[PDB]
Amino acid sequence: TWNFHQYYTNRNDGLMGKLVLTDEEKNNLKALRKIIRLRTRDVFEEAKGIAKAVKKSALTFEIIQEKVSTTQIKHLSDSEQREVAKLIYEMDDDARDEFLGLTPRFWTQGSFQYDTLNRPFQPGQEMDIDDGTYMPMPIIGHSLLILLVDASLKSLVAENHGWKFEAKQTCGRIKIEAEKTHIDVPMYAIPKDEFQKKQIAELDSENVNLALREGDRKWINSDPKIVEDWFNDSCIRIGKHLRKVCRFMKAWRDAQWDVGGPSSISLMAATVNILDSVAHDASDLGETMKIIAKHLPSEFARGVESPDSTDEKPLFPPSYKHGPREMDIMSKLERLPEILSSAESADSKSEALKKINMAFGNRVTNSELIVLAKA
Ligand SMILES: [Mg+2]
């Protein structure tokens, strides 16, 4: 019978040592995010410069266009530039007024904010950085904001070799395969007055709207602060070990799937439900990971519901809604406890390391992190 606590938690050779990024990596991602923010704000200032020239000495559309083709918005297709120029021209005094006072704001979400960003494992796997841009509007164009953020990202891509722009449904994305990193930029709309009033010092989820790229619906009520709050709360409530086991389950997914698998947020939600309803010992994360693995299939089978009550879709669908994908996820889920149990009862440290590395991959190599269990 073996103990795997050091295998999991050691910050040098242990799994945690292999997943957490160094302060340098962490700062390179902050620098990249700062770059994206600066360019977004700059492109908005250029566009607003044009619009301000429109409010002032009213100019012709063909002139507006000529000015637009000189700003970083020149990194859009000639048709998109046409769209931008148009929307800026067709603007009424009011919309233009509101627009000239709009300055985009930013707030990061996902792993990087939760502090659960794992070093990518298999080739193709990358670091996900979601940095949302919030537009303080009342209650302006959807297309105009989408085009301005798009123009910011494409303008940054036109400056760097190996960078790519991908237009996804809930965001515009910048990929950097060579650096194994990618940054999504979802756009939200928030109430202006409440934003200013709170600034002179939390908004209301009911008024935080996520813009959708295509479809009949161009906005949906979605606040990331809900999930962030929920996880932070669950972290204080459960303990410092929740983030660790969440990182471990995510690493497990990253090791069992080169691409795909259950979302990290479903694994997190389930893991928190388990740690909330089952007794465990934080001074032994191997035992805890065994409990978690043991209760995960039963959690994913019943279905995992988002900690956001406004979310109508679940993080993971229940059993009677499972297709090949969810059945595959249930296959691996049900295969993990057998691996931890097998590894626990190995015949040597090296074989225990071999068996336990069947779940998280060959990342931990030091077999001395595994030790005999005390009576
Ligand atoms: Mg993302």
- Domains of the chain, by residue range, sit at 1-20+223-375, 21-222
- Tell whether the torsion through CA atoms of 144, 145, 146 and 147 is positive or negative: positive
- Residue 171 identity: C
Under a CB-based contact definition with an 8 Å cutoff, are residues 220 and 208 in contact?
A: no
Distance (angstroms) between ligand 1 centre and the Cα of 188 equals 15
Rounded Cα distance between 170 and 219, Å, is 10
- Which of 175, 134, 137, 136 shows the shortest CA–CA distance to 153? 175
Distance (angstroms) between ligand 1 centre and the Cα of 170 equals 9
Helix (H) or strand (E) holding 173: strand 171-176
Identify the bridge partners of residue 106 per DSSP, sorted by sequence position. 133
Distance (angstroms) between ligand 1 centre and the Cα of 173 equals 8
Distance (angstroms) between ligand 1 centre and the Cα of 131 equals 9
Residue 325 has φ and ψ, to the nearest 5°, of -70, -55
> If you ran DSSP here, which 8-state letter would residue 119 be given?
P
- Tokens 């204080």 sit at which residue? 236
3-state secondary structure of 70: coil
3-state secondary structure of 371: strand
Under a CB-based contact definition with an 8 Å cutoff, are residues 87 and 144 in contact?
A: yes
Residue 20 has φ and ψ, to the nearest 5°, of -70, 135
Q: What is each CA distance from 91 to 88, 96, 194, 345, in whole angstroms?
A: 5, 6, 25, 71
Rounded Cα distance between 190 and 217, Å, is 17
Distance (angstroms) between ligand 1 centre and the Cα of 231 equals 17
What six digits make up the tokens of 300?
């994913």
- Tokens 């595994």 sit at which residue? 370
Distance (angstroms) between ligand 1 centre and the Cα of 128 equals 5
Distance (angstroms) between ligand 1 centre and the Cα of 127 equals 9
Distance (angstroms) between ligand 1 centre and the Cα of 129 equals 6
How many CB atoms are located within 10 Å of the residue 37 CB? Answer: 18
Rounded Cα distance between 240 and 153, Å, is 36
Q: Which residues are annotated as a binding site?
A: 109-114, 128, 130, 173, 184, 222, 250, 264, 311
Under a CB-based contact definition with an 8 Å cutoff, are residues 241 and 93 in contact?
A: no
What six digits make up the tokens of 339?
């691996």
Residues 6+ apart with CB under 8 A from 271: 242, 245, 246, 249, 292, 296
What six digits make up the tokens of 51?
């619009």
Max distance between CA atoms of the chain, in angstroms, equals 85
Per-position DSSP letters for 179-207, written without gaps between them: GTEEEEE-EEEEEHHHHHHHH-----GGG
3-state secondary structure of 134: strand
- Which of 360, 335, 357 shows the shortest CA–CA distance to 346? 357
Rounded Cα distance between 34 and 156, Å, is 12
Distance (angstroms) between ligand 1 centre and the Cα of 11 equals 26
How many CB atoms are located within 10 Å of the residue 92 CB? Answer: 7
Could you tell me where the DSSP H helices lie in the chain? Answer: 5-9, 15-19, 23-55, 61-68, 78-89, 93-99, 111-114, 142-157, 192-199, 224-238, 242-256, 264-277, 285-302, 324-344, 349-360
What is the resolution in angstroms?
Answer: 3.0
- For the chain, the straight-line distance linking the first and the last C-alpha, in angstroms and rounded, comes to 10
Q: What is each CA distance from 360 to 238, 251, 280, in whole angstroms?
A: 24, 6, 21
Residues 6+ apart with CB under 8 A from 210: 170, 186, 187, 188, 219, 220, 221, 222
3-state secondary structure of 360: helix
Q: Which residues are annotated as a binding site for GTP?
A: 109-114, 250, 264, 311
Residues 6+ apart with CB under 8 A from 135: 102, 104, 105, 145, 187, 188, 189, 190
- Residue 238 identity: I
* Ramachandran class of 148: left when φ > 0, alpha when ψ lies in -120 to 50, beta otherwise: alpha
Residue 255 has φ and ψ, to the nearest 5°, of -95, -25
